[PDB]
Amino acid sequence: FACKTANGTAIPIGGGSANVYVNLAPVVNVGQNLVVDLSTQIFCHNDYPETITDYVTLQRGSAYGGVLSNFSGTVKYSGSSYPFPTTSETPRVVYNSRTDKPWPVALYLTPVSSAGGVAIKAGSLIAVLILRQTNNYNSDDFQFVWNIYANNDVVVPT
Ligand SMILES: OC[C@H]1O[C@H](C/C=C\c2ccc(-c3ccccc3)cc2)[C@@H](O)[C@@H](O)[C@@H]1O
Ligand code: NI
C-alpha cells in the first residue's frame, strides 16, 4: 500500500509524511463554506490485491492556524460527515486494486463571526489529516500523514 499526490510527491510502503498545498476560495463570508476536496489530490493503491485487502481510515483530522481559530468545520469521509477537528477514527474504506483511487476526504469549513480580514495566510499550515492503513494479511499498521498548506490568502469580510 502506498500513496501519492497529483503533481506530485509520494509516501512509500510503510507510511511517512508529505506536504500538500490546496487552493482556497479567496473570499468567504460568515455562513458560506470553504470546501477543500483532497480526493482530487491524494491517491492510494493496493500493491497485491489478489491476496491482500487494505483497510484505510481517517485516523485523525486536526486544524491549525487560521482554520483552527477562524473557522468551524466538518469533514466528509467516504459518504459520511464528522466534526472537524475529528473526535474519533472513522470507519474504513477498502482498497483492493493496483489502480490509483482517491482518498475520499473533504473538509467543509465555515468562518466564525470573530473572523474578519485575512483569516488564512498564504503558505500557512491549516490542517493535518492522518491516514491509517492496515490489512487482512499481517500486522502492518501504518500512518500516512498529510500536512495541508494554504496556497493563497482567504479573506472574511468586512
Ligand atoms: O498493498 C498491499 C500490501 O502491500 C505491501 C505488502 C508488503 C509486503 C508483501 C508483499 C507481497 C506479498 C505477496 C503475497 C502473495 C503473493 C505475492 C506477494 C506479501 C507481503 C504493504 O504496504 C502492505 O501493508 C499492504 O497490505
Ligand atoms: Ni505500488
PDB file of C-alpha atoms and ligand atoms in Angstrom:
ATOM      1  CA  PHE A   1       0.000   0.000   0.000  1.00  0.00           C
ATOM      2  CA  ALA A   2       1.287   3.456  -0.985  1.00  0.00           C
ATOM      3  CA  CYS A   3       0.070   6.949  -1.711  1.00  0.00           C
ATOM      4  CA  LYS A   4       0.951   9.912  -3.891  1.00  0.00           C
ATOM      5  CA  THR A   5      -0.322  13.344  -4.750  1.00  0.00           C
ATOM      6  CA  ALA A   6      -1.244  14.800  -8.120  1.00  0.00           C
ATOM      7  CA  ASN A   7       1.952  16.591  -9.254  1.00  0.00           C
ATOM      8  CA  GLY A   8       3.426  15.224  -7.041  1.00  0.00           C
ATOM      9  CA  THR A   9       5.196  13.702  -4.067  1.00  0.00           C
ATOM     10  CA  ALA A  10       4.682  10.183  -2.699  1.00  0.00           C
ATOM     11  CA  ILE A  11       4.638   8.328   0.608  1.00  0.00           C
ATOM     12  CA  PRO A  12       6.083   4.809   0.177  1.00  0.00           C
ATOM     13  CA  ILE A  13       5.113   1.437   1.590  1.00  0.00           C
ATOM     14  CA  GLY A  14       5.236   1.584   5.374  1.00  0.00           C
ATOM     15  CA  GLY A  15       3.979   5.140   5.735  1.00  0.00           C
ATOM     16  CA  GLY A  16       5.573   8.541   6.258  1.00  0.00           C
ATOM     17  CA  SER A  17       4.571  12.207   5.770  1.00  0.00           C
ATOM     18  CA  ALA A  18       4.030  14.612   2.925  1.00  0.00           C
ATOM     19  CA  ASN A  19       3.046  18.261   2.495  1.00  0.00           C
ATOM     20  CA  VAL A  20       0.040  19.166   0.323  1.00  0.00           C
ATOM     21  CA  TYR A  21      -0.939  22.604  -0.958  1.00  0.00           C
ATOM     22  CA  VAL A  22      -4.603  23.446  -1.564  1.00  0.00           C
ATOM     23  CA  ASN A  23      -6.335  26.280  -3.442  1.00  0.00           C
ATOM     24  CA  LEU A  24      -8.891  28.139  -1.329  1.00  0.00           C
ATOM     25  CA  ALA A  25     -11.713  30.471  -2.325  1.00  0.00           C
ATOM     26  CA  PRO A  26     -10.102  33.870  -1.596  1.00  0.00           C
ATOM     27  CA  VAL A  27     -13.254  35.417  -0.175  1.00  0.00           C
ATOM     28  CA  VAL A  28     -15.683  33.547   2.049  1.00  0.00           C
ATOM     29  CA  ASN A  29     -18.451  35.047   4.173  1.00  0.00           C
ATOM     30  CA  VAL A  30     -19.886  34.098   7.520  1.00  0.00           C
ATOM     31  CA  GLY A  31     -22.450  31.420   6.624  1.00  0.00           C
ATOM     32  CA  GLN A  32     -20.648  30.184   3.456  1.00  0.00           C
ATOM     33  CA  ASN A  33     -18.389  27.082   3.187  1.00  0.00           C
ATOM     34  CA  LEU A  34     -14.812  26.667   2.097  1.00  0.00           C
ATOM     35  CA  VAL A  35     -14.693  23.218   0.556  1.00  0.00           C
ATOM     36  CA  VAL A  36     -11.235  21.591   0.486  1.00  0.00           C
ATOM     37  CA  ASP A  37     -11.591  18.405  -1.515  1.00  0.00           C
ATOM     38  CA  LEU A  38      -8.466  16.293  -1.051  1.00  0.00           C
ATOM     39  CA  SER A  39      -9.913  13.436  -3.068  1.00  0.00           C
ATOM     40  CA  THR A  40      -8.651  15.158  -6.246  1.00  0.00           C
ATOM     41  CA  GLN A  41      -5.148  15.323  -4.754  1.00  0.00           C
ATOM     42  CA  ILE A  42      -4.431  12.197  -2.714  1.00  0.00           C
ATOM     43  CA  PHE A  43      -4.480   8.829  -4.418  1.00  0.00           C
ATOM     44  CA  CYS A  44      -3.788   5.402  -2.928  1.00  0.00           C
ATOM     45  CA  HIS A  45      -3.428   1.855  -4.229  1.00  0.00           C
ATOM     46  CA  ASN A  46      -3.124  -1.754  -3.101  1.00  0.00           C
ATOM     47  CA  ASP A  47       0.126  -3.479  -4.152  1.00  0.00           C
ATOM     48  CA  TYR A  48      -1.186  -7.110  -4.063  1.00  0.00           C
ATOM     49  CA  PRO A  49      -4.951  -7.023  -4.327  1.00  0.00           C
ATOM     50  CA  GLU A  50      -5.164 -10.714  -5.345  1.00  0.00           C
ATOM     51  CA  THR A  51      -4.101 -11.804  -1.846  1.00  0.00           C
ATOM     52  CA  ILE A  52      -4.387  -8.723   0.340  1.00  0.00           C
ATOM     53  CA  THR A  53      -7.143  -6.342   1.262  1.00  0.00           C
ATOM     54  CA  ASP A  54      -6.075  -2.960   2.526  1.00  0.00           C
ATOM     55  CA  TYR A  55      -8.249  -1.045   5.030  1.00  0.00           C
ATOM     56  CA  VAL A  56      -7.988   2.740   5.230  1.00  0.00           C
ATOM     57  CA  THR A  57      -9.390   5.131   7.807  1.00  0.00           C
ATOM     58  CA  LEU A  58      -9.119   8.787   8.591  1.00  0.00           C
ATOM     59  CA  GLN A  59      -7.471   8.317  11.935  1.00  0.00           C
ATOM     60  CA  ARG A  60      -7.452  11.951  12.905  1.00  0.00           C
ATOM     61  CA  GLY A  61      -8.186  15.337  11.427  1.00  0.00           C
ATOM     62  CA  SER A  62      -6.655  18.360  13.169  1.00  0.00           C
ATOM     63  CA  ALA A  63      -6.886  22.086  12.478  1.00  0.00           C
ATOM     64  CA  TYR A  64      -4.092  24.636  12.529  1.00  0.00           C
ATOM     65  CA  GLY A  65      -3.520  28.377  12.319  1.00  0.00           C
ATOM     66  CA  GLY A  66      -6.220  30.353  10.589  1.00  0.00           C
ATOM     67  CA  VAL A  67      -8.555  27.428  10.257  1.00  0.00           C
ATOM     68  CA  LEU A  68      -8.122  26.487  13.884  1.00  0.00           C
ATOM     69  CA  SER A  69      -9.019  29.999  15.128  1.00  0.00           C
ATOM     70  CA  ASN A  70     -11.290  31.487  12.477  1.00  0.00           C
ATOM     71  CA  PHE A  71     -13.278  28.512  11.159  1.00  0.00           C
ATOM     72  CA  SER A  72     -15.580  25.780  12.332  1.00  0.00           C
ATOM     73  CA  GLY A  73     -15.732  22.591  10.272  1.00  0.00           C
ATOM     74  CA  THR A  74     -16.833  19.133   9.312  1.00  0.00           C
ATOM     75  CA  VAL A  75     -15.040  16.505   7.296  1.00  0.00           C
ATOM     76  CA  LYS A  76     -16.683  14.172   4.823  1.00  0.00           C
ATOM     77  CA  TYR A  77     -15.100  10.736   4.589  1.00  0.00           C
ATOM     78  CA  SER A  78     -16.466   8.254   2.049  1.00  0.00           C
ATOM     79  CA  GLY A  79     -20.069   9.434   2.195  1.00  0.00           C
ATOM     80  CA  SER A  80     -20.187  10.160   5.950  1.00  0.00           C
ATOM     81  CA  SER A  81     -19.715  13.508   7.730  1.00  0.00           C
ATOM     82  CA  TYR A  82     -17.879  14.154  11.002  1.00  0.00           C
ATOM     83  CA  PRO A  83     -16.884  17.144  13.088  1.00  0.00           C
ATOM     84  CA  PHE A  84     -13.579  18.689  12.074  1.00  0.00           C
ATOM     85  CA  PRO A  85     -11.430  18.503  14.179  1.00  0.00           C
ATOM     86  CA  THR A  86     -12.365  14.831  14.454  1.00  0.00           C
ATOM     87  CA  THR A  87     -13.450  13.166  17.715  1.00  0.00           C
ATOM     88  CA  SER A  88     -12.518   9.621  16.740  1.00  0.00           C
ATOM     89  CA  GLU A  89     -11.166   7.369  13.987  1.00  0.00           C
ATOM     90  CA  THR A  90     -13.646   6.750  11.122  1.00  0.00           C
ATOM     91  CA  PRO A  91     -14.945   3.535   9.596  1.00  0.00           C
ATOM     92  CA  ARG A  92     -12.684   2.035   6.942  1.00  0.00           C
ATOM     93  CA  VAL A  93     -12.599   2.108   3.174  1.00  0.00           C
ATOM     94  CA  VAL A  94     -11.388  -0.950   1.282  1.00  0.00           C
ATOM     95  CA  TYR A  95      -8.508  -0.710  -1.228  1.00  0.00           C
ATOM     96  CA  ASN A  96      -8.490  -3.763  -3.479  1.00  0.00           C
ATOM     97  CA  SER A  97      -6.889  -2.628  -6.747  1.00  0.00           C
ATOM     98  CA  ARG A  98      -3.472  -1.626  -8.136  1.00  0.00           C
ATOM     99  CA  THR A  99      -5.225   1.260  -9.892  1.00  0.00           C
ATOM    100  CA  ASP A 100      -4.881   4.596  -8.103  1.00  0.00           C
ATOM    101  CA  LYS A 101      -8.031   5.516  -6.350  1.00  0.00           C
ATOM    102  CA  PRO A 102      -8.854   8.760  -4.487  1.00  0.00           C
ATOM    103  CA  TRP A 103      -8.673   9.079  -0.721  1.00  0.00           C
ATOM    104  CA  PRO A 104     -12.266  10.344  -0.274  1.00  0.00           C
ATOM    105  CA  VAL A 105     -11.702  13.171   2.239  1.00  0.00           C
ATOM    106  CA  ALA A 106     -13.221  16.679   2.004  1.00  0.00           C
ATOM    107  CA  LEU A 107     -13.258  19.479   4.543  1.00  0.00           C
ATOM    108  CA  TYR A 108     -16.124  21.933   4.867  1.00  0.00           C
ATOM    109  CA  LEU A 109     -15.003  24.969   6.762  1.00  0.00           C
ATOM    110  CA  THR A 110     -17.148  27.936   7.777  1.00  0.00           C
ATOM    111  CA  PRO A 111     -15.943  31.249   9.330  1.00  0.00           C
ATOM    112  CA  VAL A 112     -16.897  32.030  12.930  1.00  0.00           C
ATOM    113  CA  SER A 113     -18.099  35.637  13.391  1.00  0.00           C
ATOM    114  CA  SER A 114     -14.803  36.674  15.019  1.00  0.00           C
ATOM    115  CA  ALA A 115     -13.060  36.218  11.641  1.00  0.00           C
ATOM    116  CA  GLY A 116     -12.523  39.376   9.600  1.00  0.00           C
ATOM    117  CA  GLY A 117      -9.571  40.345   7.414  1.00  0.00           C
ATOM    118  CA  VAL A 118      -7.097  37.715   6.299  1.00  0.00           C
ATOM    119  CA  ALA A 119      -8.373  34.659   8.149  1.00  0.00           C
ATOM    120  CA  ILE A 120      -5.985  32.185   6.449  1.00  0.00           C
ATOM    121  CA  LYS A 121      -2.454  33.162   5.407  1.00  0.00           C
ATOM    122  CA  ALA A 122      -0.825  32.010   2.167  1.00  0.00           C
ATOM    123  CA  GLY A 123       1.770  29.319   2.822  1.00  0.00           C
ATOM    124  CA  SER A 124       0.433  28.616   6.323  1.00  0.00           C
ATOM    125  CA  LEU A 125      -0.431  25.179   7.699  1.00  0.00           C
ATOM    126  CA  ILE A 126      -4.213  24.847   8.080  1.00  0.00           C
ATOM    127  CA  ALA A 127      -4.757  21.142   8.812  1.00  0.00           C
ATOM    128  CA  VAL A 128      -3.292  17.684   9.396  1.00  0.00           C
ATOM    129  CA  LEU A 129      -5.026  14.526   8.122  1.00  0.00           C
ATOM    130  CA  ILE A 130      -3.718  11.189   9.224  1.00  0.00           C
ATOM    131  CA  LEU A 131      -4.461   8.169   7.044  1.00  0.00           C
ATOM    132  CA  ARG A 132      -4.166   4.797   8.808  1.00  0.00           C
ATOM    133  CA  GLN A 133      -3.676   1.648   6.736  1.00  0.00           C
ATOM    134  CA  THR A 134      -3.969  -1.954   7.829  1.00  0.00           C
ATOM    135  CA  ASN A 135      -4.802  -5.178   6.019  1.00  0.00           C
ATOM    136  CA  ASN A 136      -6.175  -8.722   6.294  1.00  0.00           C
ATOM    137  CA  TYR A 137      -2.738 -10.284   5.811  1.00  0.00           C
ATOM    138  CA  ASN A 138      -0.228  -9.342   8.549  1.00  0.00           C
ATOM    139  CA  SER A 139       0.334  -6.899  11.443  1.00  0.00           C
ATOM    140  CA  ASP A 140       1.106  -3.928   9.211  1.00  0.00           C
ATOM    141  CA  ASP A 141      -0.320  -0.817  10.801  1.00  0.00           C
ATOM    142  CA  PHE A 142       0.901   2.379   9.109  1.00  0.00           C
ATOM    143  CA  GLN A 143       0.181   6.106   9.225  1.00  0.00           C
ATOM    144  CA  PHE A 144       0.354   8.379   6.189  1.00  0.00           C
ATOM    145  CA  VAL A 145       0.439  11.989   7.421  1.00  0.00           C
ATOM    146  CA  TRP A 146      -0.787  14.804   5.148  1.00  0.00           C
ATOM    147  CA  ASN A 147       0.153  18.270   6.189  1.00  0.00           C
ATOM    148  CA  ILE A 148      -2.205  20.707   4.473  1.00  0.00           C
ATOM    149  CA  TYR A 149      -0.967  24.168   3.468  1.00  0.00           C
ATOM    150  CA  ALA A 150      -2.874  27.185   2.115  1.00  0.00           C
ATOM    151  CA  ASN A 151      -1.717  28.305  -1.315  1.00  0.00           C
ATOM    152  CA  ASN A 152      -3.439  31.688  -1.025  1.00  0.00           C
ATOM    153  CA  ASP A 153      -4.920  34.149   1.473  1.00  0.00           C
ATOM    154  CA  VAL A 154      -8.556  33.752   2.433  1.00  0.00           C
ATOM    155  CA  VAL A 155     -10.450  36.906   3.472  1.00  0.00           C
ATOM    156  CA  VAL A 156     -13.623  37.038   5.538  1.00  0.00           C
ATOM    157  CA  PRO A 157     -15.496  40.386   5.142  1.00  0.00           C
ATOM    158  CA  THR A 158     -15.637  43.134   6.297  1.00  0.00           C
TER     159      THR A 158
HETATM  160  O1  LIG B   1      -0.974  -3.027  -0.630  1.00  0.00           O
HETATM  161  C1  LIG B   1      -0.971  -4.367  -0.175  1.00  0.00           C
HETATM  162  C2  LIG B   1       0.190  -4.587   0.756  1.00  0.00           C
HETATM  163  O2  LIG B   1       1.340  -4.021   0.177  1.00  0.00           O
HETATM  164  C3  LIG B   1       2.544  -4.082   0.918  1.00  0.00           C
HETATM  165  C4  LIG B   1       2.900  -5.539   1.067  1.00  0.00           C
HETATM  166  C5  LIG B   1       4.215  -5.749   1.762  1.00  0.00           C
HETATM  167  C6  LIG B   1       4.807  -6.966   1.721  1.00  0.00           C
HETATM  168  C7  LIG B   1       4.223  -8.129   0.941  1.00  0.00           C
HETATM  169  C8  LIG B   1       4.379  -8.095  -0.430  1.00  0.00           C
HETATM  170  C9  LIG B   1       3.890  -9.112  -1.232  1.00  0.00           C
HETATM  171  C10 LIG B   1       3.250 -10.200  -0.678  1.00  0.00           C
HETATM  172  C11 LIG B   1       2.731 -11.272  -1.638  1.00  0.00           C
HETATM  173  C12 LIG B   1       1.676 -12.107  -1.287  1.00  0.00           C
HETATM  174  C13 LIG B   1       1.221 -13.063  -2.193  1.00  0.00           C
HETATM  175  C14 LIG B   1       1.795 -13.183  -3.455  1.00  0.00           C
HETATM  176  C15 LIG B   1       2.841 -12.344  -3.815  1.00  0.00           C
HETATM  177  C16 LIG B   1       3.301 -11.393  -2.910  1.00  0.00           C
HETATM  178  C17 LIG B   1       3.095 -10.244   0.706  1.00  0.00           C
HETATM  179  C18 LIG B   1       3.581  -9.214   1.513  1.00  0.00           C
HETATM  180  C19 LIG B   1       2.370  -3.354   2.240  1.00  0.00           C
HETATM  181  O3  LIG B   1       2.183  -1.965   2.010  1.00  0.00           O
HETATM  182  C20 LIG B   1       1.171  -3.908   2.964  1.00  0.00           C
HETATM  183  O4  LIG B   1       0.940  -3.101   4.081  1.00  0.00           O
HETATM  184  C21 LIG B   1      -0.050  -3.901   2.082  1.00  0.00           C
HETATM  185  O5  LIG B   1      -1.077  -4.583   2.747  1.00  0.00           O
HETATM  186 NI    NI B   2       2.762   0.301  -5.816  1.00  0.00          NI
END
